């Protein structure tokens, strides 16, 4: 008889003219049973509407070879997938999610092999957009977007995906699991700390810990370890974890993260000289786990804390006095350190170089400004929308029968 | 204004156009554009993405990164010398013009908050113009200069939505 792949191609257009999409999901998955070059021949006379759903099945086999993507000619195959995502769109995509995701993870693995994964970022973000509502549902392509940005630094495209918080993942037909959930948040934390957006980083990092698990994974160690470092910047000791945290984070991970527990302990004494000595003791761990450079920030943040506690206590204090106590050891650096912080807005202070003093202010708000009224009013609109998400979700359980 | 749009078209262009390593002028504008926003982390990361191939090919790019190394230290007098060091016509100048004026404003603004009193010679480094030119300017703005010692002193609709919400 004839070949399976030619017979399969003409059928798809029928199922794409009709409401009978569930059939179509089967036809792309099998794809021709055994495949080779044979798919490349279908593409030429594949258009009659758009190129249809079928094309996605062709692209999934060719990249999933685990060899050449399509001879040294691979750039052509790349031009075809940007065409699928852009012009075709996909409105029957909810069904396609399994192949779409497989294909997308496979793309990222191949681009990572190439000279730089830069060229991949631009197709991969538009690729996610098509499966989403317009509200933004979180799925595994989100994780892989962050990975491309991490390797080839250009964090800027990924930020609108990250800066949005959500409820419910993209489902129906698989295409998703808890590791993807954890890796997306791990990396998204990694990026925000870099931007020095300590607020979003903390929050991203937390979501990578609160996830349920009954098994150990490499992402769970890293997520915990990065959490301790971030909380050492934001807070004066480690920040709280809820009681819906996974069992695994207590039982296995804590003797696993001993070094970090010692970082947090030395930081609580409030002495940089000791923290510094510890970082060289613990060094090899920092390098193998590769949260180097972050560990350095925790040291600068102690010096910031040590300067900032003085503010609480003193109206006026000398630079020489600050310098001995903080252990800056140079009044010139005391002046340099607050001045960095003035630009940042972590401190409200003024320098008197006639007297050789620092004067602390501390009066950003008197709380009777209309500025403060508008700020409180903006915060209320957020709450009323948050409640509305909860109402739709409580109601949804009300429809479901109770157990 | 104009610059913000210029980052947008360029940001798009980095991912879309090349095979993964884009050409030398595009990277230079983009780097220069990150310094105007004072988004120094992404700038630094930009240079680290840059291979050794572009650093030999293009020296201008390496000058733009040098201003930026100093911005990280936040040492003003050093910033100014580097602005003068390199120019690249058309391709670097409109954005460069903005970089120079963005750091001077940052510097005057910084000092105004930072110091209730400052030495005039240190201030001269910040704005980056000599003592005669500076002391002349401060007086017009309305800041006090002390002379002899030479010190310078810087100087219903919401409510119904909410009621509707709580009553329900």
From Swiss-Prot, chain A:
Domain PCI: start-end pairs: 197-365
Subcellular location: Cytoplasm; Nucleus
Chief location bin: cytoplasm
GO terms under cellular component: COP9 signalosome; cytoplasm; cytosol; nucleoplasm; nucleus; perinuclear region of cytoplasm
Pfam families referenced in this protein's UniProt entry, alphabetically: COP9_hel_rpt (PF22788), CSN3-like_C (PF21215), PCI (PF01399)
SUPFAM superfamilies: Winged helix' DNA-binding domain (SSF46785)
Spans traversing the lipid bilayer: none
Keywords per UniProt: Acetylation, Cytoplasm, Nucleus, Phosphoprotein, Signalosome
GO biological process: in utero embryonic development; protein deneddylation; protein neddylation; regulation of DNA damage response, signal transduction by p53 class mediator; regulation of protein neddylation; response to light stimulus; signal transduction; ubiquitin-dependent protein catabolic process
Tissue: Widely expressed. Expressed at high level in heart and skeletal muscle.
Modified residues (N-acetylalanine): 2
Assembly and interaction partners: Component of the CSN complex, composed of COPS1/GPS1, COPS2, COPS3, COPS4, COPS5, COPS6, COPS7 (COPS7A or COPS7B), COPS8 and COPS9 isoform 1. In the complex, it probably interacts directly with COPS1, COPS4, COPS8 and COPS9 isoform 1. Interacts with CK2 and PKD. Interacts with the translation initiation factor EIF3S6 and IKBKG. Interacts with ERCC6.
Assigned protein family: Belongs to the CSN3 family.
Other facts: Amplified and overexpressed in some osteosarcomas (OS), suggesting that it may participate in TP53 degradation in OS.
Summary of the function given for this chain in its UniProt record: Component of the COP9 signalosome complex (CSN), a complex involved in various cellular and developmental processes. The CSN complex is an essential regulator of the ubiquitin (Ubl) conjugation pathway by mediating the deneddylation of the cullin subunits of SCF-type E3 ligase complexes, leading to decrease the Ubl ligase activity of SCF-type complexes such as SCF, CSA or DDB2. The complex is also involved in phosphorylation of p53/TP53, c-jun/JUN, IkappaBalpha/NFKBIA, ITPK1 and IRF8/ICSBP, possibly via its association with CK2 and PKD kinases.
Name recorded for this polypeptide: COP9 signalosome complex subunit 3
Source organism of this protein record: Homo sapiens (Human)
From Swiss-Prot, chain B:
Domain of life: Eukaryota
Boundaries of every PCI domain copy: 1-155
Localization (cell): Cytoplasm; Nucleus
GO cellular component, one term: perinuclear region of cytoplasm
Chief localisation class: cytoplasm
Keyword match Iron: no
GO biological process: activation of NF-kappaB-inducing kinase activity; COP9 signalosome assembly; negative regulation of cell population proliferation; protein deneddylation; protein neddylation; protein phosphorylation; regulation of protein neddylation
Its biological purpose: Component of the COP9 signalosome complex (CSN), a complex involved in various cellular and developmental processes. The CSN complex is an essential regulator of the ubiquitin (Ubl) conjugation pathway by mediating the deneddylation of the cullin subunits of SCF-type E3 ligase complexes, leading to decrease the Ubl ligase activity of SCF-type complexes such as SCF, CSA or DDB2. The complex is also involved in phosphorylation of p53/TP53, c-jun/JUN, IkappaBalpha/NFKBIA, ITPK1 and IRF8/ICSBP, possibly via its association with CK2 and PKD kinases.
PANTHER family the UniProt entry points to: COP9 SIGNALOSOME COMPLEX SUBUNIT 8 (PTHR13339:SF0)
Protein known as: COP9 signalosome complex subunit 8
Species, as recorded: Homo sapiens
């Amino acid at each position: 008889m004839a070949s399976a792949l030619e017979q399969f191609v003409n059928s798809v257009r029928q199922l794409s003219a009709q409401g009978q999409m569930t059939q179509l999901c089967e036809l792309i998955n099998k794809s021709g049973e055994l495949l080779a070059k044979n798919l490349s021949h279908l593409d030429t006379v594949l258009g009659a509407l758009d190129v249809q759903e079928h094309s996605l099945g062709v692209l999934a086999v060719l990249f999933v070879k685990f060899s050449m993507p399509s001879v040294p000619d691979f750039e052509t195959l790349f031009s075809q997938v940007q065409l699928f995502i852009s012009t075709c769109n996909g409105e029957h995509i909810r069904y396609a999610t399994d192949t779409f995701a497989g294909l997308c993870h496979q793309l990222t693995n191949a681009l990572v092999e190439r000279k730089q994964p830069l060229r991949g970022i631009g197709i991969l973000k538009q690729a996610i957009d098509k499966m989403q509502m317009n509200t933004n549902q979180l799925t595994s392509i989100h994780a892989d977007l962050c990975q491309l940005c991490l390797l080839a630094k250009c964090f800027k495209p990924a930020l609108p995906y990250l800066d949005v918080d959500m409820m419910d993942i993209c489902k129906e037909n698989g295409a998703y699991d808890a590791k993807h959930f954890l890796c997306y948040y791990y990396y998204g934390g990694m990026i925000y700390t870099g931007l020095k957006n300590f607020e979003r980083a903390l929050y991203f990092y937390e979501q990578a810990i609160t996830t349920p698990a009954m098994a150990v994974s490499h992402i769970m160690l890293e997520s915990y370890k990065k959490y301790i470092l971030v909380s050492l910047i934001l807070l004066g000791k480690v920040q709280q974890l809820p009681k819906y945290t996974s069992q695994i984070v207590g039982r296995f991970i804590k003797p696993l993260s001993n070094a970090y527990h010692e970082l947090a302990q030395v930081y609580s004494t409030n002495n940089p000289s000791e923290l510094r000595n510890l970082v060289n003791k613990h060094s090899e761990t920092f390098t193998r786990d590769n949260n180097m450079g972050l560990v350095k920030q925790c040291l600068s943040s102690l010096y910031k804390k040590n300067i900032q506690r003085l503010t609480k206590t003193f109206l006026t204090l000398s630079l020489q006095d600050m310098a001995s106590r903080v252990q800056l050891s140079g009044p010139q650096e005391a002046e340099k350190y607050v001045l960095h912080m003035i630009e940042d807005g972590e401190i409200f202070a003024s320098i008197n170089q006639k007297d050789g003093m620092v004067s602390f202010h501390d009066n950003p708000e008197k709380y009777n400004n209309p500025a403060m009224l508008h700020n409180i009013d903006q915060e209320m609109l957020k709450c009323i929308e948050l409640d509305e998400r909860l109402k739709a979700m409580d109601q949804e359980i009300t429809v479901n029968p109770q157990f | 204004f104009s610059f913000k749009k210029l980052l947008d078209q360029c940001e798009n262009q980095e991912l879309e156009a090349p095979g993964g390593i884009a050409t030398p002028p595009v990277y230079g504008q983009l780097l220069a554009l990150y310094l105007l926003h004072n988004d120094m982390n992404n700038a630094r990361y930009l240079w680290k993405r840059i291979p050794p191939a572009i650093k030999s090919a293009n020296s201008e790019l390496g000058g733009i990164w040098s201003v930026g190394q100093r911005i990280w230290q936040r040492d003003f007098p050093g910033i100014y010398t580097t602005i003068n060091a390199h120019q690249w016509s058309e391709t670097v100048q409109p954005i460069m013009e903005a970089l120079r004026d963005a750091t001077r404003r940052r510097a005057f603004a910084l000092v105004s908050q930072a110091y209730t009193s400052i030495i005039a010679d240190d201030f001269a480094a910040f704005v980056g113009l000599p003592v005669e030119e500076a002391v002349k300017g401060i007086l017009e703005q309305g800041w006090q200069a002390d002379s002899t010692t030479r010190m310078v002193l810087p100087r219903l609709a919401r409510l119904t939505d909410y009621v509707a919400f709580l009553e329900n």
